[PDB]
Amino acid sequence: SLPGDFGFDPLGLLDPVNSGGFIEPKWLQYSEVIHARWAMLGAAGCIAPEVLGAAGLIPDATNIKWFESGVIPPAGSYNGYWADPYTIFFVEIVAMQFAELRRLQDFRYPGSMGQQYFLGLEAIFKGSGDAAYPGGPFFNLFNLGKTEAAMKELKLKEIKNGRLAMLAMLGYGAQAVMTGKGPFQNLVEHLADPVNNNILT
Amino acid sequence: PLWLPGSTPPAHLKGDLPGDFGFDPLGLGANAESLKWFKESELVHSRWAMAAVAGILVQEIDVFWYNAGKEPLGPLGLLAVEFFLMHWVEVRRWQDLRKPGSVDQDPIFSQYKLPPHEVGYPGGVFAPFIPGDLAELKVKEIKNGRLAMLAFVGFVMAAQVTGKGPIAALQEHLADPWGTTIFS
Amino acid sequence: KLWAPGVVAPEYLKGDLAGDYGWDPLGLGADPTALKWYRQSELQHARWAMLGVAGVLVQEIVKAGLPQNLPEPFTNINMLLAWEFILMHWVEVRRWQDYKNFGSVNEDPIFKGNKVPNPEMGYPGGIFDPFGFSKGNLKELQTKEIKNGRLAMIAYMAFILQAQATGKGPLAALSAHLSNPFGNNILKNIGTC
Amino acid sequence: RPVWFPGNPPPAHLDGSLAGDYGFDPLFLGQEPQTLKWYVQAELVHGRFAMLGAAGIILTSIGAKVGLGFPEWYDAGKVVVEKNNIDFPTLMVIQFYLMGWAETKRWYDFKNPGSQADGSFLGFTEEFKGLENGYPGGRFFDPMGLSRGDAAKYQEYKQKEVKNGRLAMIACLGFAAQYAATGKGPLDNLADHLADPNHVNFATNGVSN
Ligand SMILES: CC(/C=C/C=C(C)/C=C/[C@@]12O[C@]1(C)C[C@@H](O)CC2(C)C)=C\C=C\C=C(C)\C=C\C=C(C)\C=C\[C@@]12O[C@]1(C)C[C@@H](O)CC2(C)C
Ligand SMILES: CC(/C=C/C=C(C)/C=C/[C@@]12O[C@]1(C)C[C@@H](O)CC2(C)C)=C\C=C\C=C(C)\C=C\C=C(C)\C=C\[C@@]12O[C@]1(C)C[C@@H](O)CC2(C)C
Ligand SMILES: CC1=C[C@H](O)CC(C)(C)[C@H]1/C=C/C(C)=C/C=C/C(C)=C/C=C/C=C(C)/C=C/C=C(C)/C=C/C1=C(C)C[C@H](O)CC1(C)C
Ligand SMILES: CC1=C[C@H](O)CC(C)(C)[C@H]1/C=C/C(C)=C/C=C/C(C)=C/C=C/C=C(C)/C=C/C=C(C)/C=C/C1=C(C)C[C@H](O)CC1(C)C
């Protein structure tokens, strides 16, 4: 019934007999998807400057590696920002508090977020019975997957780009600790001398 | 007839009183006890303001009305004859509220009595000329009244900002309208 | 019609409205009291923005440029926001009650014979329409009001993020590409005040 | 109806009948109805003292930040005491008598609806009635008689009053945790933040607090 089912569970997690807590079918399909959606943001978001900068669109300052942005101060922090990294992290917490807890309240109560006023948006945030796939004019402006078949296939398309982008992030990290360079400088140096620029070296 | 045309007046204001233009954002006139009191303070307040703003102008048609405080019978000598005369008079008006008719009769010369009358509009002695007619006058009274009340706070903030009185502050405004506002 | 192929419009956006296009993906018009106010505001934006974009370039052609404003137009200094604050207060609040109460404020407070005709709310007519444009294509014109409007609003939002990034009046911003297109873009002006 | 934590339904013991009732007692404190009747007065008075206090700082502080005369709220007790003739111990004791009297009478209205109403005082009978736990009214407590005006007009103010109450209580404690973390006045804390808001935050000096 879940999309991305190619039958891969050595560890009997999704087995619904005597389930409890966070080892719940409804729950994990959710995680994987939200995981997928974030992972694809990170994958395309980590590289883009290193690429676009090298491409010569982005100035000399901005064109940094992913771990040199000021997330991990000791690996490098940026300067040229609207503010310091901590006056940001607060603007983050308030926002992600709102926009993650709301999303939790659709999971917890389907109908909720539809009733209690929220600057006109309460009309929007009704849900879709299914949690992972809310839609409505906010989160599906183009009304794509107009049929049940075309939707199920788009749900197939989503999870696979995701799972790939999650491994890609497991990539960029495990890669950055051993190399100490960004996964686009690793790629171009690997085009130049495939056997010299390698794990084994 | 309304302070803000197209408004509905509040429920308690029904156009019975003189200068009821449907105005009580904070339902001040909500309870009949309080609205009976507030009626008086709004007469008397204007009556004192009309009397005073009439004064300020005509006394300066000179010197600063504000520093008139500095003027033949000592200070405490004069503050007494005010206190007793004002205490006398104000108590007697305040009885007419305490009970609507309680006072009307000349305690000395009890031959002379003030005829039955609406509160705060006493007449008899106090309406000799019996001038212009019926309520309309009471509506000039409260209008001309409020304008006088406002003008006074004007006259005060006009003093406490320019230094000059009213007619000079105007002559100053005429000289440089674009310049002599609060916004400069 | 509509705003995107493959989307269904919402049940409040019937098409009754001059420039309906099933465009509200944040729910905001789903309240019917909000949809009456917002559309006064959207009218109100448009109808400035169109004086607003006109004003820019008709005085850009007869002289960044707009952003700068202080002593220059035969005024050493004259201090003024009095005239605006009182009249624009006077005026707007008369609109205020004509939303607050559809009909109340269609008549002259002083010379009570005079009277703006029963419009639609925000389409006052009478003296606000003295070239006898009452009748004809009422709603076709209203589709022109909003669509020239909505351009002008994004035209002005445009002129400004120009007038900052570059510091150029948006004719002189145009005619800085007429010369050097590939080397004079957003991409070279993300950049700067 | 609107709630503190949208979606999560409000707990039974909250009706939507009391002013500022947003289904918020996550710790089951005010469950037994008497023990909540008690807290709806604590909250009101707390908020009324907090409002007077916040209005009390917010005016002195601009008065000090408008002309170099008035003292900062922190070091403005000694400035009142030293400069003027008066002593601390007596004020603190005078206060306790008047506040003692004022409270000890409210004290015996919580447990007894219309207790002090009996005229057993200065013949003042009708002024010290019950009415509604938290709003005593009459010629003294509600002179103008908004209490005895209209049903809706008064209901809306209960709403206004508790909210302002809760905002002033927050406001007040900021004043108290802002002098602490930065050692300055609340229109020096406000001027410094308007001139350079991105940098002058807590992030600078004011820690987790
Ligand atoms: C009025 C206006 C500008 C007015 C400017 C004026 C008077 C200019 C005056 C002057 O120039 C002169 C003449 C001469 C100069 O010397 C001085 C200045 C002072 C410079 C701009 C509006 C500008 C208005 C803009 C840009 C508004 C855009 C709104 C949008 C896009 C909203 C869209 C949506 O709301 C919907 C419809 C539905 C939802 O579901 C989804 C979202 C997306 C939220
Ligand atoms: C914030 C506050 C109290 C907060 C309490 C909260 C949040 C309670 C919340 C909860 O219980 C609920 C509802 C439900 C539970 O399930 C959970 C919790 C979360 C437990 C009170 C502040 C209250 C603040 C007050 C009363 C301050 C007033 C100050 C006074 C009176 C006088 C002082 C001054 O005079 C000086 C000394 C010098 C002058 O210069 C200046 C002034 C300031 C004027
Ligand atoms: C399923 C199963 C089944 C069976 O039964 C068993 C087994 C097999 C065991 C299991 C498991 C599997 C696995 C391995 C999984 C994995 C996952 C992952 C990795 C995820 C990620 C995931 C991931 C993710 C989300 C991520 C994200 C990220 C991001 C956003 C980023 C961001 C950023 C950026 C841009 C930039 C800056 O500067 C930095 C940062 C800030 C950093
Ligand atoms: C919802 C909605 C709604 C409406 O209706 C419509 C619309 C709007 C359309 C929609 C939206 C959408 C979106 C947002 C999307 C997104 C996407 C993405 C971003 C993806 C990525 C995605 C991504 C991905 C996969 C990624 C991947 C990656 C990879 C493999 C990597 C690789 C690598 C590695 C490791 C290492 C080395 O050394 C380098 C490299 C070689 C580089």
Coordinates of N, CA and C in Angstrom, one line a residue, chain C:
Chain C
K1 N -8.8 32.7 -19.3 CA -9.6 32.2 -18.1 C -8.6 31.5 -17.1
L2 N -9.1 31.3 -15.9 CA -8.3 30.6 -14.8 C -6.9 31.3 -14.8
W3 N -5.9 30.6 -14.2 CA -4.5 31.1 -14.0 C -3.4 30.1 -14.3
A4 N -3.8 28.8 -14.5 CA -2.9 27.7 -14.7 C -3.7 26.5 -15.2
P5 N -3.3 25.8 -16.4 CA -3.9 24.6 -16.9 C -3.7 23.5 -15.9
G6 N -4.7 22.8 -15.5 CA -4.7 21.6 -14.6 C -5.0 21.9 -13.2
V7 N -5.6 23.1 -12.9 CA -6.0 23.5 -11.5 C -7.5 23.8 -11.5
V8 N -8.2 23.4 -10.5 CA -9.6 23.8 -10.2 C -9.7 25.0 -9.3
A9 N -10.6 26.0 -9.6 CA -10.7 27.3 -8.9 C -11.6 27.0 -7.7
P10 N -11.5 27.9 -6.6 CA -12.3 27.6 -5.4 C -13.7 28.2 -5.4
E11 N -14.6 27.7 -4.5 CA -16.0 27.9 -4.5 C -16.4 29.3 -4.2
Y12 N -15.5 30.1 -3.6 CA -15.8 31.6 -3.4 C -15.4 32.4 -4.6
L13 N -14.4 32.0 -5.4 CA -14.0 32.6 -6.7 C -14.9 31.9 -7.8
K14 N -16.1 32.5 -8.0 CA -17.1 32.0 -9.0 C -16.6 32.5 -10.3
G15 N -16.3 33.8 -10.5 CA -16.0 34.4 -11.7 C -16.8 35.7 -11.9
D16 N -17.8 35.8 -11.0 CA -18.6 37.0 -10.7 C -17.7 38.3 -10.7
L17 N -16.5 38.2 -10.2 CA -15.6 39.3 -10.0 C -14.7 39.7 -11.2
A18 N -14.6 41.0 -11.5 CA -13.9 41.5 -12.7 C -12.4 41.3 -12.6
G19 N -11.9 40.1 -13.1 CA -10.5 39.7 -13.0 C -10.3 38.5 -12.1
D20 N -11.4 37.8 -11.8 CA -11.3 36.5 -11.2 C -10.4 35.6 -12.1
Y21 N -9.6 34.7 -11.5 CA -8.7 33.8 -12.2 C -8.4 32.6 -11.3
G22 N -9.3 32.2 -10.4 CA -9.0 31.1 -9.4 C -7.6 31.2 -8.8
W23 N -7.1 32.4 -8.5 CA -5.8 32.6 -8.0 C -5.9 33.1 -6.5
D24 N -5.9 32.1 -5.6 CA -5.8 32.3 -4.1 C -5.2 31.0 -3.5
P25 N -3.9 30.7 -3.6 CA -3.4 29.5 -2.9 C -2.9 29.7 -1.5
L26 N -3.4 30.7 -0.8 CA -3.2 30.9 0.7 C -4.5 31.1 1.5
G27 N -5.6 30.7 0.8 CA -7.0 30.6 1.4 C -7.6 32.0 1.7
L28 N -6.9 33.1 1.5 CA -7.2 34.4 2.2 C -8.6 34.9 1.9
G29 N -9.1 34.6 0.8 CA -10.5 35.1 0.3 C -11.6 34.2 0.7
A30 N -11.3 33.0 1.3 CA -12.3 31.9 1.7 C -13.3 32.4 2.8
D31 N -12.9 33.4 3.6 CA -13.8 34.3 4.3 C -14.4 35.3 3.4
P32 N -15.7 35.6 3.4 CA -16.4 36.5 2.5 C -16.4 38.0 2.9
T33 N -16.1 38.3 4.1 CA -15.9 39.6 4.7 C -14.5 40.1 4.3
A34 N -13.5 39.2 4.3 CA -12.1 39.5 3.9 C -12.0 39.8 2.4
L35 N -12.8 39.1 1.6 CA -12.7 39.2 0.1 C -13.3 40.5 -0.3
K36 N -14.2 41.1 0.5 CA -14.8 42.5 0.2 C -13.7 43.5 0.5
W37 N -13.0 43.4 1.7 CA -11.9 44.3 2.1 C -10.7 44.2 1.2
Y38 N -10.1 43.0 1.1 CA -8.9 42.8 0.3 C -9.1 43.5 -1.1
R39 N -10.3 43.3 -1.7 CA -10.5 43.8 -3.1 C -10.7 45.3 -3.1
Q40 N -11.0 45.9 -2.0 CA -10.9 47.4 -1.9 C -9.4 47.7 -1.8
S41 N -8.6 47.0 -1.1 CA -7.1 47.2 -0.9 C -6.4 47.0 -2.3
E42 N -6.7 45.8 -2.9 CA -6.1 45.5 -4.3 C -6.5 46.7 -5.3
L43 N -7.8 47.1 -5.4 CA -8.2 48.3 -6.1 C -7.3 49.4 -5.7
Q44 N -7.2 49.7 -4.4 CA -6.5 50.9 -3.8 C -5.0 50.9 -4.2
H45 N -4.3 49.7 -4.1 CA -2.9 49.5 -4.6 C -2.9 49.9 -6.1
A46 N -3.4 49.1 -6.9 CA -3.5 49.3 -8.4 C -3.6 50.8 -8.6
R47 N -4.7 51.5 -8.2 CA -5.1 52.8 -8.6 C -4.0 53.9 -8.2
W48 N -3.2 53.6 -7.1 CA -2.0 54.4 -6.8 C -0.9 54.0 -7.8
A49 N -0.4 52.7 -7.7 CA 0.7 52.2 -8.5 C 0.6 52.7 -10.0
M50 N -0.6 52.9 -10.5 CA -0.8 53.3 -11.9 C -0.6 54.9 -12.0
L51 N -1.1 55.6 -11.0 CA -0.6 57.0 -10.9 C 0.9 57.0 -10.6
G52 N 1.4 55.9 -9.9 CA 2.7 55.8 -9.2 C 3.8 55.5 -10.2
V53 N 3.5 54.7 -11.2 CA 4.5 54.3 -12.3 C 4.4 55.3 -13.4
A54 N 3.3 55.9 -13.7 CA 3.1 57.1 -14.6 C 3.9 58.2 -14.0
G55 N 3.7 58.6 -12.8 CA 4.4 59.7 -12.1 C 5.9 59.6 -12.3
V56 N 6.5 58.4 -12.0 CA 7.9 58.1 -12.1 C 8.4 58.6 -13.5
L57 N 7.9 58.0 -14.6 CA 8.5 58.0 -15.9 C 8.1 59.3 -16.7
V58 N 6.9 59.8 -16.5 CA 6.5 61.1 -17.1 C 7.3 62.3 -16.5
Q59 N 7.9 62.1 -15.3 CA 8.8 63.2 -14.7 C 10.2 62.7 -14.8
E60 N 10.4 61.4 -15.2 CA 11.8 60.9 -15.5 C 12.1 61.4 -16.9
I61 N 11.1 61.5 -17.8 CA 11.3 61.9 -19.2 C 11.3 63.4 -19.3
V62 N 10.8 64.1 -18.3 CA 10.9 65.6 -18.2 C 11.8 66.0 -17.0
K63 N 13.0 65.4 -17.0 CA 14.1 65.9 -16.1 C 15.4 65.3 -16.6
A64 N 18.3 57.2 -6.7 CA 18.4 57.5 -8.1 C 17.7 58.8 -8.4
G65 N 16.6 58.8 -9.3 CA 15.8 60.0 -9.6 C 14.6 60.1 -8.6
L66 N 13.6 59.2 -8.8 CA 12.5 59.1 -7.8 C 13.0 59.0 -6.4
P67 N 13.8 58.0 -6.0 CA 14.1 57.7 -4.6 C 14.5 59.0 -3.9
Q68 N 15.4 59.8 -4.5 CA 15.8 61.1 -3.9 C 14.6 62.0 -4.0
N69 N 14.4 62.7 -2.9 CA 13.3 63.8 -2.8 C 13.4 64.6 -1.4
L70 N 13.5 65.9 -1.6 CA 13.8 66.9 -0.5 C 13.8 68.3 -1.0
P71 N 14.7 69.2 -0.7 CA 14.7 70.5 -1.4 C 15.3 70.4 -2.8
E72 N 14.5 70.8 -3.8 CA 14.9 70.9 -5.3 C 13.8 71.6 -6.1
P73 N 12.5 71.2 -6.0 CA 11.5 71.8 -6.9 C 11.0 73.2 -6.7
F74 N 11.9 74.2 -6.4 CA 11.7 75.6 -6.0 C 11.1 75.5 -4.5
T75 N 11.9 75.1 -3.6 CA 11.7 75.0 -2.2 C 13.0 74.9 -1.4
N76 N 13.5 76.0 -0.8 CA 14.7 76.0 0.0 C 14.6 74.9 1.1
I77 N 13.4 74.5 1.4 CA 12.9 73.9 2.7 C 11.5 74.5 2.9
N78 N 10.5 73.8 3.4 CA 9.2 74.4 3.8 C 8.6 73.4 4.9
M79 N 9.4 72.6 5.5 CA 8.9 71.7 6.6 C 7.8 70.8 6.1
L80 N 4.4 70.6 6.4 CA 3.7 70.3 5.1 C 2.8 69.1 5.3
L81 N 3.4 68.0 5.9 CA 2.7 66.7 6.2 C 1.4 66.9 7.0
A82 N 1.2 68.2 7.3 CA -0.1 68.7 7.9 C -1.2 68.7 6.8
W83 N -1.0 69.3 5.7 CA -2.0 69.3 4.5 C -2.4 67.9 4.2
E84 N -1.4 67.0 4.0 CA -1.7 65.5 3.7 C -2.5 64.9 4.8
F85 N -1.9 64.9 6.0 CA -2.5 64.2 7.2 C -3.9 64.6 7.5
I86 N -4.3 65.8 7.2 CA -5.7 66.3 7.5 C -6.6 65.9 6.3
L87 N -6.2 66.3 5.0 CA -7.1 66.0 3.8 C -7.1 64.5 3.6
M88 N -6.0 63.8 3.4 CA -6.0 62.4 3.2 C -6.7 61.6 4.4
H89 N -6.6 62.2 5.6 CA -7.4 61.7 6.7 C -8.9 61.9 6.4
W90 N -9.2 63.2 6.1 CA -10.6 63.6 5.7 C -11.2 62.6 4.7
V91 N -10.4 62.4 3.6 CA -10.9 61.7 2.4 C -11.1 60.3 2.8
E92 N -10.0 59.6 3.1 CA -9.9 58.1 3.4 C -11.1 57.7 4.3
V93 N -11.2 58.4 5.4 CA -12.3 58.0 6.4 C -13.7 58.1 5.8
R94 N -13.9 58.8 4.7 CA -15.2 58.9 4.0 C -15.3 57.6 3.2
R95 N -14.2 57.1 2.7 CA -14.1 55.7 2.1 C -14.4 54.7 3.2
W96 N -13.7 54.9 4.4 CA -13.9 54.0 5.5 C -15.3 53.7 5.8
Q97 N -16.2 54.7 5.9 CA -17.6 54.4 6.3 C -18.4 53.8 5.1
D98 N -17.9 54.1 3.8 CA -18.5 53.6 2.6 C -18.1 52.1 2.4
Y99 N -17.2 51.6 3.1 CA -17.0 50.1 3.3 C -17.8 49.8 4.6
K100 N -17.7 50.5 5.7 CA -18.3 50.3 7.0 C -19.8 50.3 6.8
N101 N -20.4 51.0 5.9 CA -21.8 51.1 5.6 C -22.1 51.5 4.2
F102 N -22.5 50.6 3.3 CA -22.4 50.6 1.8 C -22.8 52.0 1.2
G103 N -23.8 52.7 1.8 CA -24.5 53.8 1.1 C -24.3 55.1 1.8
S104 N -24.0 55.1 3.1 CA -24.2 56.2 4.1 C -23.6 57.5 3.5
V105 N -22.4 57.4 2.8 CA -21.4 58.5 2.7 C -21.4 58.9 1.2
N106 N -22.5 58.9 0.5 CA -22.6 59.2 -1.0 C -23.2 60.6 -1.2
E107 N -23.1 61.4 -0.2 CA -23.8 62.8 -0.2 C -22.9 63.8 0.5
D108 N -23.0 65.1 0.1 CA -22.2 66.2 0.5 C -22.5 66.6 1.9
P109 N -21.6 66.4 2.9 CA -21.8 67.0 4.3 C -22.3 68.4 4.4
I110 N -21.8 69.3 3.5 CA -22.2 70.8 3.5 C -23.4 71.1 2.6
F111 N -23.1 71.0 1.3 CA -24.1 71.4 0.2 C -25.0 70.2 -0.2
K112 N -25.9 69.8 0.7 CA -26.5 68.4 0.8 C -27.3 68.0 -0.4
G113 N -27.5 68.9 -1.4 CA -28.1 68.6 -2.7 C -27.2 67.7 -3.5
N114 N -25.9 67.9 -3.4 CA -24.8 67.2 -4.2 C -24.7 65.7 -3.6
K115 N -24.3 64.8 -4.5 CA -24.6 63.3 -4.2 C -23.9 62.5 -5.3
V116 N -22.9 61.7 -4.9 CA -22.2 60.6 -5.7 C -23.3 59.6 -5.9
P117 N -23.5 59.0 -7.2 CA -24.5 58.0 -7.4 C -24.1 56.7 -6.9
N118 N -25.1 56.0 -6.3 CA -25.0 54.6 -5.9 C -24.1 53.9 -6.9
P119 N -22.8 53.6 -6.5 CA -21.8 53.0 -7.4 C -22.0 51.4 -7.3
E120 N -20.9 50.7 -7.5 CA -20.5 49.5 -6.7 C -19.4 50.0 -5.7
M121 N -19.3 49.3 -4.6 CA -18.3 49.6 -3.5 C -16.9 49.7 -4.1
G122 N -16.4 50.9 -4.2 CA -15.0 51.3 -4.7 C -15.1 51.7 -6.1
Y123 N -16.3 52.0 -6.7 CA -16.5 52.4 -8.1 C -17.4 53.6 -8.1
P124 N -17.0 54.7 -7.3 CA -17.9 55.8 -6.9 C -18.7 56.5 -8.0
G125 N -18.1 56.7 -9.1 CA -18.8 57.3 -10.3 C -19.2 58.8 -9.9
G126 N -20.4 59.2 -10.5 CA -20.7 60.7 -10.5 C -19.5 61.5 -10.9
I127 N -19.2 62.5 -10.1 CA -18.1 63.5 -10.3 C -16.8 62.7 -10.4
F128 N -16.7 61.5 -9.9 CA -15.5 60.7 -10.0 C -15.5 59.9 -11.4
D129 N -16.4 60.4 -12.3 CA -16.5 59.8 -13.6 C -17.3 60.8 -14.6
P130 N -16.7 62.0 -14.8 CA -17.4 63.1 -15.5 C -17.4 63.0 -17.0
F131 N -16.7 62.1 -17.6 CA -16.7 61.8 -19.1 C -17.7 60.7 -19.4
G132 N -18.9 60.8 -18.7 CA -20.0 59.9 -19.0 C -19.6 58.5 -19.4
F133 N -18.8 57.8 -18.5 CA -18.3 56.5 -18.7 C -19.0 55.5 -17.7
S134 N -20.2 55.9 -17.2 CA -21.0 55.1 -16.3 C -21.2 53.8 -16.9
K135 N -21.9 53.7 -18.0 CA -22.5 52.5 -18.7 C -21.5 52.1 -19.8
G136 N -21.7 50.9 -20.3 CA -21.1 50.5 -21.6 C -20.5 49.1 -21.4
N137 N -19.3 49.0 -20.8 CA -18.6 47.7 -20.6 C -18.1 47.7 -19.1
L138 N -19.0 48.2 -18.2 CA -18.7 48.3 -16.8 C -17.6 47.3 -16.4
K139 N -17.8 46.0 -16.7 CA -17.0 44.9 -16.1 C -15.8 44.6 -16.9
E140 N -15.9 44.9 -18.2 CA -14.8 44.8 -19.2 C -13.7 45.8 -18.7
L141 N -14.2 47.0 -18.4 CA -13.3 48.1 -17.9 C -12.7 47.7 -16.6
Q142 N -13.5 47.1 -15.7 CA -13.0 46.6 -14.4 C -12.0 45.5 -14.5
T143 N -12.0 44.7 -15.6 CA -11.0 43.7 -15.9 C -9.8 44.4 -16.4
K144 N -9.9 45.6 -17.0 CA -8.8 46.5 -17.4 C -8.2 47.2 -16.2
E145 N -9.0 47.7 -15.3 CA -8.6 48.4 -14.0 C -7.6 47.5 -13.4
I146 N -8.0 46.2 -13.1 CA -7.2 45.3 -12.2 C -5.9 44.8 -12.9
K147 N -6.0 44.5 -14.2 CA -4.9 43.9 -15.0 C -3.8 44.9 -15.4
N148 N -4.2 46.1 -15.7 CA -3.2 47.3 -15.8 C -2.7 47.5 -14.4
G149 N -3.6 47.6 -13.4 CA -3.3 47.7 -12.0 C -2.1 46.7 -11.6
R150 N -2.4 45.4 -11.7 CA -1.5 44.3 -11.1 C -0.2 44.3 -11.8
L151 N -0.1 44.6 -13.1 CA 1.2 44.9 -13.8 C 1.9 46.1 -13.0
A152 N 1.3 47.3 -13.0 CA 1.8 48.5 -12.4 C 2.4 48.2 -11.0
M153 N 1.7 47.4 -10.2 CA 2.1 47.0 -8.8 C 3.4 46.3 -8.9
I154 N 3.6 45.3 -9.9 CA 4.8 44.6 -10.1 C 5.8 45.4 -10.9
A155 N 5.3 46.4 -11.7 CA 6.1 47.4 -12.4 C 6.8 48.3 -11.4
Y156 N 6.2 48.6 -10.3 CA 6.7 49.6 -9.2 C 7.6 48.8 -8.3
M157 N 7.2 47.6 -7.8 CA 8.1 46.6 -7.1 C 9.3 46.4 -7.9
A158 N 9.2 46.4 -9.2 CA 10.4 46.3 -10.1 C 11.2 47.6 -10.1
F159 N 10.7 48.7 -10.5 CA 11.5 50.0 -10.6 C 12.4 50.2 -9.4
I160 N 11.9 49.8 -8.2 CA 12.5 50.1 -6.9 C 13.7 49.1 -6.7
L161 N 13.5 47.8 -6.7 CA 14.6 46.8 -6.6 C 15.6 47.1 -7.7
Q162 N 15.3 47.8 -8.8 CA 16.2 48.4 -9.7 C 16.9 49.6 -8.9
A163 N 16.1 50.6 -8.6 CA 16.6 51.9 -8.0 C 17.5 51.7 -6.8
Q164 N 17.5 50.5 -6.3 CA 18.4 50.1 -5.1 C 19.7 49.4 -5.6
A165 N 19.5 48.2 -6.1 CA 20.6 47.3 -6.6 C 21.6 48.1 -7.5
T166 N 21.0 48.9 -8.4 CA 21.8 49.7 -9.4 C 21.9 51.2 -9.0
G167 N 20.9 51.8 -8.5 CA 20.8 53.2 -8.2 C 20.4 54.0 -9.5
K168 N 19.7 53.4 -10.4 CA 19.3 54.0 -11.7 C 17.8 54.2 -11.7
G169 N 17.3 55.4 -12.1 CA 16.0 55.6 -12.6 C 15.6 54.6 -13.7
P170 N 14.5 54.0 -13.7 CA 14.2 52.8 -14.6 C 14.0 53.1 -16.1
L171 N 14.1 54.3 -16.6 CA 14.5 54.6 -18.1 C 16.0 54.4 -18.2
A172 N 16.8 55.1 -17.4 CA 18.2 55.1 -17.4 C 18.7 53.7 -16.9
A173 N 17.9 52.9 -16.3 CA 18.2 51.5 -16.0 C 18.1 50.6 -17.2
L174 N 17.0 50.8 -18.0 CA 16.8 50.3 -19.4 C 18.0 50.6 -20.2
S175 N 18.3 51.9 -20.4 CA 19.4 52.4 -21.3 C 20.7 52.3 -20.6
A176 N 20.9 51.3 -19.7 CA 22.2 50.8 -19.3 C 22.4 49.4 -19.8
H177 N 21.4 48.9 -20.6 CA 21.5 47.6 -21.2 C 21.5 47.7 -22.8
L178 N 20.8 48.7 -23.3 CA 20.9 49.2 -24.7 C 22.4 49.3 -25.1
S179 N 23.3 49.5 -24.1 CA 24.7 49.5 -24.3 C 25.4 48.2 -24.0
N180 N 25.2 47.6 -22.8 CA 26.0 46.5 -22.2 C 25.2 45.4 -21.6
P181 N 24.4 44.7 -22.4 CA 23.4 43.8 -21.9 C 24.0 42.7 -21.1
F182 N 24.9 41.9 -21.7 CA 25.4 40.6 -21.1 C 26.3 40.9 -19.9
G183 N 26.7 42.2 -19.8 CA 27.6 42.6 -18.6 C 27.0 43.7 -17.8
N184 N 25.7 43.7 -17.6 CA 24.9 44.7 -16.8 C 23.5 44.2 -16.4
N185 N 23.5 43.1 -15.6 CA 22.3 42.4 -15.1 C 22.2 42.4 -13.6
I186 N 21.1 41.9 -13.0 CA 21.0 41.4 -11.6 C 22.3 40.7 -11.2
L187 N 22.8 39.8 -12.1 CA 24.0 38.9 -11.9 C 25.2 39.8 -11.6
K188 N 25.3 41.0 -12.0 CA 26.4 42.0 -11.7 C 25.9 43.1 -10.7
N189 N 24.7 43.1 -10.3 CA 24.1 44.1 -9.3 C 23.3 43.4 -8.2
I190 N 23.4 42.1 -7.9 CA 22.7 41.5 -6.8 C 22.9 42.5 -5.6
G191 N 24.1 42.5 -5.1 CA 25.1 43.6 -5.1 C 24.5 45.0 -4.7
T192 N 25.1 45.6 -3.7 CA 25.3 47.0 -3.4 C 23.9 47.7 -3.0
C193 N 24.0 48.9 -2.6 CA 22.8 49.8 -2.4 C 22.2 50.2 -3.7

